[PDB]
């Protein structure tokens, strides 16, 4: 069981090229459109970048290990992945917080959430994620770095879940108020997909990290940690799914997707 | 040229019957939702009834509800309104108007007092 | 390190 | 009565006008199109060089 | 090219003014009052409400100007003038260019059995019959894109402005919720 | 008294109806049945002008055939340069609701109006540097639907109060009033000569006015619903009319009747705009089904389709040299087609 299950090198590149082509299509589909130039799609643009960037950055790894079959070389690639990975999780939160503001302010939002502020926020998140990622990979051998990643991810997941749940409660409040003038499954399904895909794809990697810190010696844990490549595949599987559950959901974007 | 000629209006006894006929020419009858409107002496134009392109959707005003019956013939461009058990408050000039656009659910400006696609109007008097 | 592999923190040591 | 009297005077005035046959009216529209057919750069697209748009 | 460069500097200035206007246009929430232009603030939120009293009672053309509008403010006084108002609401509600716009309804000036025979067998009194009579039109062809917001006003004019603010908030909310497929 | 006049009017109408049928010996379809078709006219978007926030309700080309002006409900009147795609001017309006916009033949002034019932004349030259409203023409009781310059001094304007009005910009009061329409007048069209103009109203009737005299020469009927757009055939002896009954119709001024109808079963939606080609052989419509159809004026055949607009296409203009066609939409985008 402590054999360290490894997946064939040919499949990493497969997921790599599909996620790469899906995300460059999505960013184009909104870059060309001026109607799809609202603060909402600027955060979806940031996600499409992060998702694509972690696929090639990971696809790159599979190509380099196959060719290599060095130390300074890896710190380069890993610092990209780790930085590009945080940017993805922060981008998903940033979409969730934007969606929350559009509903629970709705009037104030339009003036407080400016194109300038969207521009500096996206850039400030990407700049913080890149610096934190490089800082994490340089001090990878450290115990604190892994504890930070786990704590940060759990916080991101908690907030993200809380926001979408609170929205669904405000959506249920409306549907209940539309009982006087004449059902809940529409909101429950989309809420279950959004919070379900994120957890299923990501958490497993961070369950590996918390075991890495807690139980490296435990017979039960080592069998879970043995499947590290399968966890990386799931993190890559999120990059191909993001376009389907975020971008393609809007009618205007889906129309431009079918056109291109 | 859009034409709408009213006929079958005159002096009737209270509780009597009258049948109005509205001959249409110049436009494809079947495409337009047809209406009836009346203008009482010293009052404004008030809607009475409408009938859909096919003749499925049929709606009246509360005052003529369950007493008046609208019917349209497409084969012979003609719009009818059978008026049963009349009372003096019905005494008004009845006009035959069509909605401006074809294949439209919404019907605008039919009681505008300056509407182009409305007939000459026929007199209906209910007196002893 | 000596023999690099996919991601980081994959091997327990 | 005023609106009706004005409508009668308009019809009467536009009733007494000289009308030509639709054959001649059509032949004039047909002859015009055939004359200015070459000048029109929508009927026969101009070479890319001559075209103001995209060089 | 010197003249092409000179024309870019003029385009640069104009583009910098449009981005400033774009924010102002998106910030302001447009209203359409029919029973001229007025700008007012409620909790530092800009509203731009245009009256249509100057035009004729033939609406079928100039009504099309409004669909970028946030919501329509409809006023109905309580001849059979009440039925004429219902027919006006039906038309606006079913129109091909207005099948996205919500309608904030205002019943002011507070026999019915004569002009409406359905009231004799109605039990819930007269106010809620006139309210319901407008709601039955809104629920029939709605499709969940737009809703109707009825309100009773003794025409005192106190606390009328706040009602429109709260309704405006509900329309933008529902509009987004449906965009995220969460409604 | 009213019965005698109303019956006499019906007699005159029948006399005119019988006179028109006496002139109809052969239809336009028969004459142009034995000429080669235009073929397939396929045109692709050469430029895409973007900058308008709201729906673009009307536009108009210049006599230079280079510059064009556009109007949007946001309250901005933007003068573009087609060739370069650069913006030349951008005017903030007093009233955001604007429904028409004209560009003077000289290219010195620019007119616009809408629900404000007022036509605004803006001066572009302005030696000071900034573009400011020169004269503000008020008098119309209803919304201003269309306005068209003759020179720098006079402007013809049709409004939604059943009246077109010739103005004098210098003095700023109506020179002549044109009455006859029963419905809202929606569009204007001036002949090559400024002597005559035609106006289509919301009473399925188009009327030929004499600018000098100020009385309706001829009245044209045949449309089933409201006429939205009207346009003169480049010769000036015919005009095409686009109505909500999903049909365009060509009329002849000398024949004083209908020549041809441009209808197809697939179209069940209204026509917003109408314009001829340089030679007049093509007739571009523009429908509220988000696309535009290019017709063969002589043969009633359909040549092609200009598809690319997401939303309603409201305005559609051709240049004086007839090099390109610019269609404005509720997208908030102009598109140049060639
Ligand atoms: Ca590594």
Q: List the structure tokens of D29.
A: 């529209």
The verdict on F237 touching D (C-beta cutoff 8 Å) is yes
What sign does the dihedral A229-A234-A236-A240 (CA atoms) show? positive
Helices (H), E95-159: 112-115, 126-140
Question: Residue F45: helix, strand or coil by DSSP?
Answer: strand
Count how many domains chain D has. Answer: 1
Question: Residue F160: helix, strand or coil by DSSP?
Answer: coil
The experimental method, as deposited, was: cryo-EM
The verdict on F329 touching D (C-beta cutoff 8 Å) is no
Q: Are residues F85 and F68 in contact, defined by beta-carbon separation less than 8 angstroms?
A: no
Q: Are residues B77 and B60 in contact, defined by beta-carbon separation less than 8 angstroms?
A: no
Residues in F closer than 8 angstroms to D54, CB to CB, are 46
Helices (H), chain E: 2-27, 81-94, 112-115, 126-140, 160-179
Q: List the structure tokens of A225.
A: 């940690």
* DSSP bridge partners of F189: F198
Q: How far apart are CA D1 and CA E20, in angstroms?
A: 57
Treating both helix axes as pointing N-terminal to C-terminal, what angle do A115-138 and A39-68 enclose, rounded to 10 degrees? 20
**In 3D, which of F265, F250, F232, F228 has the Cα closest to residue F299?**
F250
**Level-2 CATH architecture, domain F1-337:** 7 Propeller (2.130)
Q: Are residues F150 and F63 in contact, defined by beta-carbon separation less than 8 angstroms?
A: no
Q: How far apart are CA F50 and CA E19, in angstroms?
A: 13
Q: How far apart are CA F180 and CA A109, in angstroms?
A: 52
The verdict on F100 touching A (C-beta cutoff 8 Å) is no
The verdict on E18 touching A (C-beta cutoff 8 Å) is no
Q: Are residues B36 and B44 in contact, defined by beta-carbon separation less than 8 angstroms?
A: no
Domain residues of chain A, as ranges?
Answer: 1-260
Q: Which structural domain range is residue B68 located in?
A: 5-126
Contact flag C7-A232 (C-beta cutoff 8 Å): yes
Nearest residue, CB atoms, E177 vs list A174, A181, A249:
A174
Q: Could you tell me if residue F229 is left (phi over 0), alpha (psi between -120 and 50 degrees) or otherwise beta?
A: beta
Distance from CA of E148 to the nearest CA of A (A): 9
Q: How far apart are CA F328 and CA F59, in angstroms?
A: 7
Sequence-distant (6+) residues with CB within 8 A of A99 are A40, A163, A164, A167, E176, E180
Q: Are residues F296 and F282 in contact, defined by beta-carbon separation less than 8 angstroms?
A: yes
Distance C9 CA to ligand 1 centre (A): 8
Q: How far apart are CA F126 and CA F132, in angstroms?
A: 8
Q: How far apart are CA F6 and CA E47, in angstroms?
A: 51
Q: How far apart are CA F246 and CA F264, in angstroms?
A: 8
Mind spelling out the 3-state secondary structure of chain A? Answer: CCCCCCCCHHHHHHHHHHHHHHHHHHHHHHHCCCCCCCHHHHHHHHHHHHHHHHHHHHHHHHHHHHHHCCHHHHHHHHHHHHHHHHHHHHHHHHHHHHHHHHHHCCCCHHHHCCHHHHHHHHHHHHHHHHHHHHHHHHCCCCHHHHHHHHHHHHHHHHHHHHHHHHHHHHHHHHHHHCCCCCCCHHHHHHHHHHHHHHHHHHHHHHHHHHHHHHCCCCHHHHHHHCCHHHHHHHHHHHHHHHHHHHHCCCHHHHHHHHHC
Nearest residue, CB atoms, F86 vs list E11, E48, E50:
E11
Distance A141 CA to ligand 1 centre (A): 12
The verdict on F222 touching D (C-beta cutoff 8 Å) is no
Exposure class string for B21-31: b at 16+ Cβ within 10 A, else e: bbebebbebeb
Q: How far apart are CA A243 and CA A25, in angstroms?
A: 10
**In 3D, which of F159, F79, F156 has the Cα closest to residue F123?**
F79
Q: List the structure tokens of E66.
A: 């409004």
Q: Which position has the token pair 């005009």?
A: F239
Q: How far apart are CA F277 and CA F43, in angstroms?
A: 13
A74 is in an annotated binding site: yes
Radius of gyration, CA atoms only, chain C: 7
Q: How far apart are CA E5 and CA E8, in angstroms?
A: 5
Distance from CA of E158 to the nearest CA of B (A): 33
Radius of gyration, CA atoms only, chain E: 21
CATH code (residue B107): 2.60.40.10
Q: List the structure tokens of A202.
A: 């990501």
Exposure class string for E125-144: b at 16+ Cβ within 10 A, else e: eeeeebbebbbebbeeeeee
Q: List the structure tokens of F232.
A: 């003169």
Instruction: Work out whether strand F163-168 and strand F282-284 pair parallel, antiparallel, or are unpaired.
Output: unpaired
Q: Could you tell me if residue B102 is left (phi over 0), alpha (psi between -120 and 50 degrees) or otherwise beta?
A: beta
First to last CA, chain C: 11
Q: List the structure tokens of A201.
A: 């794809």
Residues in B closer than 8 angstroms to F221, CB to CB, are 1, 26
Sequence-distant (6+) residues with CB within 8 A of D24 are F254
Q: Are residues F200 and F227 in contact, defined by beta-carbon separation less than 8 angstroms?
A: yes
Instruction: Work out whether strand B11-12 and strand F173-179 pair parallel, antiparallel, or are unpaired.
Output: unpaired
Number of neighbours of residue A174 by Cβ within 10 angstroms? 17
Distance from CA of A12 to the nearest CA of F (A): 40
Q: Which structural domain range is residue D49 located in?
A: 1-55
A61 is in an annotated binding site: yes
Q: Are residues B79 and B22 in contact, defined by beta-carbon separation less than 8 angstroms?
A: yes
Nearest residue, CB atoms, D26 vs list F31, F83, F281:
F31
Q: How far apart are CA E103 and CA E89, in angstroms?
A: 9
Count how many domains chain B has. Answer: 1
Contact flag E179-A250 (C-beta cutoff 8 Å): yes
Residues comprising chain C, all counted? 13
Residues in E closer than 8 angstroms to B115, CB to CB, are 58
With CA atoms as reference, the chain E residue closest to A179 would be E139
């Amino acid at each position: 069981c402590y054999e360290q299950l490894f997946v064939s090198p040919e499949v990493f590149v497969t997921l790599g090229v599909i996620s790469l082509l899906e995300n460059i299509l999505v960013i184009v589909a909104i870059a060309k459109n001026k109607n799809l130039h609202s603060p909402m799609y600027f955060f979806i643009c940031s996600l499409a970048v992060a998702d694509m960037l972690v696929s090639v950055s990971n696809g790159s790894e599979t190509i380099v290990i196959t060719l290599l079959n060095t130390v300074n070389i890896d710190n380069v690639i890993d610092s990209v992945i780790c930085s590009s990975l945080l940017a993805s999780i922060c981008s998903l939160l940033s979409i969730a917080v934007d969606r929350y503001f559009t509903i629970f302010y709705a009037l104030q939002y339009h003036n407080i959430m400016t194109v300038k502020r969207v521009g500096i926020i996206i850039s400030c998140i990407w700049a913080a994620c890149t610096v934190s990622g490089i800082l994490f990979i340089i001090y990878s051998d450290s115990s604190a770095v892994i504890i930070c990643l786990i704590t940060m991810f759990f916080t991101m997941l908690a907030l993200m879940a809380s926001l979408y749940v609170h929205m669904f409660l405000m959506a249920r409040l409306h549907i209940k108020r539309i009982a006087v003038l004449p059902a809940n499954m529409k909101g429950a399904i989309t809420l279950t997909i959004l919070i379900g895909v994120f957890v299923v794809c990501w958490a497993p990697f961070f369950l590996h990290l918390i075991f890495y810190i807690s139980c490296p010696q435990n017979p039960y844990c080592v069998c879970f940690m043995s499947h590290f490549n399968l966890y990386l595949i799931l993190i890559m599987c999120n990059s191909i799914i993001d376009p389907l559950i975020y971008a393609l959901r809007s009618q205007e974007l889906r129309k431009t997707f079918k056109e291109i | 040229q859009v034409q709408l000629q009213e006929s079958g209006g005159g002096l009737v006894q209270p509780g009597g019957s009258l049948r109005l006929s509205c001959a249409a020419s110049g436009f494809t009858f079947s495409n337009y939702k047809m209406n009836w409107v009346r203008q009482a002496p010293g009052k404004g134009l008030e809607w009475v009834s409408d009938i859909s392109q096919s003749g499925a959707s049929i709606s009246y005003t509360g005052s003529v509800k369950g007493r008046f019956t609208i019917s349209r013939d497409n084969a012979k461009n003609t719009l009818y309104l059978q008026m049963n058990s009349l009372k003096p408050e019905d005494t008004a000039v009845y006009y035959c108007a069509r909605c401006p656009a074809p294949f439209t659910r919404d019907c605008f400006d039919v009681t505008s007092t300056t509407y182009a696609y409305r007939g000459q109007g026929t007199q209906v008097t209910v007196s002893s | 390190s000596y023999s690099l592999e996919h991601x980081r923190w994959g091997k327990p040591v | 009565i005023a609106q009706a009297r004005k409508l009668v005077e308009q019809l009467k005035m536009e009733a007494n006008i000289d009308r030509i046959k639709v054959s001649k009216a059509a032949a004039d529209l047909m002859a015009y199109c055939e004359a200015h057919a070459k000048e029109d750069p929508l009927l026969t697209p101009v070479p890319a060089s001559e075209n103001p748009f995209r060089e | 090219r010197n003249e092409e460069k000179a024309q870019r500097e003029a385009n640069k200035k104009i583009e910098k003014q449009l981005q400033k206007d774009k924010q102002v246009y998106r910030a302001t929430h447009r209203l359409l009052l029919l029973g001229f232009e007025t700008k007012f603030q409620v909790d530092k939120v800009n509203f731009h409400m245009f009256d249509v009293g100057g035009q004729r009672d033939e609406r079928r053309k100039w009504i099309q100007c409004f669909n970028d509008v946030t919501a329509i403010i409809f006023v109905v006084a309580s001849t059979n003038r009440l039925q004429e108002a219902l027919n006006l609401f039906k038309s606006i509600w079913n129109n091909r260019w207005l099948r996205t716009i919500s309608v904030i309804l205002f019943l002011n000036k507070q026999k019915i059995e004569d002009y409406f025979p359905e009231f004799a067998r109605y039990t819930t009194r007269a106010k809620y019959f006139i309210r319901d009579e407008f709601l039955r039109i809104s629920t029939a062809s709605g499709d969940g894109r737009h809703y109707c917001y009825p309100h009773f006003t003794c025409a005192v004019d106190t606390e009328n402005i706040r009602r429109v603010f709260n309704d405006c908030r509900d329309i933008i909310q529902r509009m987004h919720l449906r965009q995220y497929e969460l409604l | 008294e009213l019965d005698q006049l109303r019956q006499e009017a019906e007699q005159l109408k029948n006399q005119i109806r019988d006179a028109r049928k006496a002139c109809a010996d052969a239809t336009l379809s028969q004459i142009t049945n034995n000429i080669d078709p235009v073929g397939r006219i396929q045109m692709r978007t050469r430029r895409t002008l973007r900058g308008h926030l709201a729906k673009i309700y009307a536009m108009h080309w210049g006599t230079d055939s280079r510059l064009l002006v556009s109007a949007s409900q946001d309250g901005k009147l933007i003068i573009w340069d087609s060739y370069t795609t650069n913006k030349v001017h951008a005017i903030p309006l007093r009233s955001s609701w604007v429904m028409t916009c004209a560009y003077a033949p000289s290219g010195n002034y620019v007119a616009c109006g809408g629900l404000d019932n007022i036509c605004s004349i803006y001066n572009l030259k302005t030696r000071e540097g900034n573009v400011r409203v020169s004269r503000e023409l008020a008098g119309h009781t209803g919304y201003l639907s269309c306005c068209r310059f003759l020179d720098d001094n006079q402007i013809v304007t049709s409004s939604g109060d059943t009246t077109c009005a010739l103005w004098d910009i210098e003095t700023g009061q109506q020179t002549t009033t044109f009455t006859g329409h029963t419905g809202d007048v929606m569009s204007l069209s001036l002949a090559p000569d400024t002597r005559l103009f035609v106006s289509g109203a919301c009473d399925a009737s188009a009327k030929l006015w004499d600018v000098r005299e100020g009385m309706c020469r001829q009245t044209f009927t045949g449309h089933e619903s409201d006429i939205n757009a009207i346009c003169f055939f480049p010769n000036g002896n015919a005009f095409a009319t686009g109505s909500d009954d999903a049909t365009c119709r060509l009329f002849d001024l000398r024949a004083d009747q209908e020549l041809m109808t441009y209808s197809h079963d697939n179209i069940i939606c209204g026509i917003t705009s109408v314009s001829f080609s340089k030679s007049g052989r093509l007739l571009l419509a523009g429908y509220d089904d988000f696309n535009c159809n290019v017709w063969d004026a002589l043969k009633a055949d359909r040549a092609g389709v200009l598809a690319g607009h997401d939303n309603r296409v409201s305005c559609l203009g051709v240049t004086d040299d007839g090099m390109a066609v610019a269609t404005g939409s509720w997208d908030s985008f102009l598109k140049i087609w060639n």
